[PDB]
Design a binder for this molecule. Structure first.
Ligand SMILES: Cc1nc(Nc2ncc(C(=O)Nc3c(C)cccc3Cl)s2)cc(N2CCN(CCO)CC2)n1
Ligand SMILES: Cc1nc(Nc2ncc(C(=O)Nc3c(C)cccc3Cl)s2)cc(N2CCN(CCO)CC2)n1
Ligand SMILES: Cc1nc(Nc2ncc(C(=O)Nc3c(C)cccc3Cl)s2)cc(N2CCN(CCO)CC2)n1
Ligand SMILES: Cc1nc(Nc2ncc(C(=O)Nc3c(C)cccc3Cl)s2)cc(N2CCN(CCO)CC2)n1
Lengths: 331, 331
């Protein structure tokens, strides 16, 4: 049965939400859609409400809309943002033209978590452990489109963590993405953890290619196999040798740090993509002895993404979307 | 001997330019600096004058400034933007805080060449020949920092073309950049040529990973070697099979096109990075039979980029820059 809806204008756009979602307040926005904090009277919790920007303008917008709705529906893990409600003021498919997604509200982005200065080792243990627990689960789903990453992490005031869904190209580039999508994740975590222990950026370049040179001061130079197939000799020269800079080592960089943190980082911040630590291995590490529960670290159910390779008109995506909204049982 | 400088305010910023550069008119801008068209009285030609944005604010701005000055100083090829003049109103290193760079003016971006509707096949031969002549020269300079790209091409009205210098990361990503930096270039050109012949984007995605699926429709699926080392079986499944969409083939897509144009594209738009045609091979190809001159397709002089590996304070880069400004002889 359709609940009483109520209508209001926030930042020059019309919001029509169910009775339960009171005291809407705009927190921020991006291309995807606008978000509002709201007090859900029913369950008595401060909540997040998103209204999608023109969800069925184009095929891309339409599939994008359906994708996010399917993903947050599937994501059921205490470290990954999940769908609490989805709704529309529309009462028929023809009329249907406005979609709202509802989740829990996290209060602090990554870029605020760093500056959130006074952090005990325990907070770091907990934060990193949660990203890893999330990551294990996220990798297990094999999500074709990439919306969940470590950098999208979000944190409410007691350090409880969730990974949100935000925060001409040659084939060899995107094949490389697929190839290393899990490895790069654990590099991000590594960088993130480092910043939580020091408060400074770990690998600051003058630019992105100079960034590689910085990384290697800690990681060492690539294996012969990687170097011997660079497209030129001057390319090999750039990655087969460090220039003579002052010597820096892990023990130096993370001096005040719990030595187990330094151990963990020495297995995360490794250049050899194969030798680098995997998420579920990283969980078993001694640094997380408090938190590590091998039977409380679940993988995902298979996730049917056959939709990703269907080529459909706008109206076909809109129908799929509206079928999901009407099917949704609010937990 | 310092010429007479004159001063004016253009877009709330003070421009001080030598007597010869009259009738300054702003055309466009980027984070690097703002650009003006100007009538150079001396050589009597419409010219481009760029004023660098706060060139010595930080180390990055300072090295950046120096790099661009070294690059365009080194680049001497008629398909690659080159430095005609660099100047400063400053008369001592302590004063020195503003820098201007002068090149030829083009007046048509890539995104303006597409829509430039009625183009003979001749225009395409000539446009594509010049990018390839460029790229050969560019690739041969082994330029550590990437500012010169196919997509950065610019054109004047008689179809004369020049490549301009504008248009947390894991090591495996940038290592990959280095690896394929030449092969991706030929992919871009392939894509550009395709559009020139048709007017539609060749590989339209819904998103970037979906684009790989679009590409494979034409290129087929990756070799077993590329497949057998994806990080999951679901990834293996994405790239080991096309889904059953309409069959599409090169001959179809480029129907009205010169058949030799199609031949070249079937050698450019190849997935296997090794089999893919190289810039210099693409030159020798029958499609540019009238333009191809193997003794007029020069490689670069070595380019001393030892500076890219130096860590220097702002003031050190500012002196190198100032030294280059005073040393420069205007052709
Ligand atoms: C834009 C923004 N969002 C914040 N929190 C959010 N939580 C969850 C969000 C979200 O979009 N959920 C969601 C929904 C609803 C649907 C589909 C998918 C998803 Cl993932 S947005 C906090 C925030 N700030 C306020 C507090 N500032 C200072 C800290 O002291 C920092 C900035 N700004
Ligand atoms: C590692 C990586 N992945 C990217 N995107 C991906 N999309 C899909 C991916 C993929 O593996 N999906 C997948 C999975 C997980 C399972 C089965 C099947 C499939 Cl298909 S990976 C983008 C990206 N970068 C672009 C942006 N750069 C920052 C500049 O702003 C950083 C580098 N890096
Ligand atoms: C930003 C821009 N630049 C244009 N031409 C240029 N030529 C060379 C440029 C340049 O910056 N040189 C340079 C310099 C000086 C120093 C260092 C390095 C370099 Cl590379 S800028 C044309 C243009 N327009 C777009 C299209 N519009 C509509 C047509 O209907 C006309 C105007 N916009
Ligand atoms: C192929 C590629 N290269 C990138 N940058 C490079 N920097 C340095 C490179 C390099 O090979 N230098 C070099 C050379 C040439 C010789 C000797 C020694 C050296 Cl060090 S290649 C970035 C990049 N991207 C993917 C696509 N994204 C599009 C977003 O819109 C942008 C980022 N792709």
């Amino acid at each position: 049965e359709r609940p009483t809806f109520y209508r209001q204008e926030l930042n020059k756009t019309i919001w029509e939400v169910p009775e339960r979602y009171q005291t809407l307040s705009p927190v921020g926005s991006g291309a995807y859609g606008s978000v509002c904090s709201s007090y859900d009277v029913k369950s008595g919790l401060k909540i997040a409400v998103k209204k999608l920007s023109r969800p069925f303008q184009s095929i891309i917008h339409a599939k994008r809309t359906y994708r996010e709705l399917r993903l947050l529906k599937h994501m059921k893990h205490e470290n990954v943002i999940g769908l609490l409600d989805v709704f529309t003021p529309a009462t028929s498919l023809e009329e249907f033209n406005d979609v709202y997604l509802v989740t829990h509200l996290m209060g602090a982005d990554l870029n605020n978590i760093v500056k959130c200065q006074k952090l005990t080792d325990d907070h770091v243990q907990f934060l990193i452990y949660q990203i890893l627990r999330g990551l294990k689960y996220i990798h297990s789903a094999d999500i074709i489109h990439r919306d969940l990453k470590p950098s999208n992490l979000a944190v409410n005031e007691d350090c409880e963590l969730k990974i949100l869904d935000f925060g001409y190209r040659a084939p060899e580039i995107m094949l490389n993405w697929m190839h290393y999508n899990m490895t790069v994740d654990i590099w991000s975590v590594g960088c993130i953890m480092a910043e939580l222990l020091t408060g400074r950026t770990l690998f600051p370049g003058t630019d992105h290619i100079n960034q590689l040179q910085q990384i290697m001061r800690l990681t060492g130079t690539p294996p012969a196999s990687v170097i011997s197939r660079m497209p030129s000799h001057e390319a090999r020269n750039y990655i087969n040798s460090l220039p003579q800079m002052p010597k820096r080592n892990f023990a130096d960089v993370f001096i005040g740090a719990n030595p187990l943190a330094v151990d963990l980082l020495e297995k995360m911040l490794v250049l050899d993509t194969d030798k680098r630590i995997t998420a579920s291995e990283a969980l078993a590490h001694p640094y997380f002895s408090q938190y590590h529960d091998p039977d409380d670290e679940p993988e995902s159910e298979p996730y049917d993404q056959s939709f990703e390779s269907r080529q459909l008109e706008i109206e076909e995506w809109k129908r799929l979307t509206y079928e999901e909204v009407c099917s949704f049982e609010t937990p």
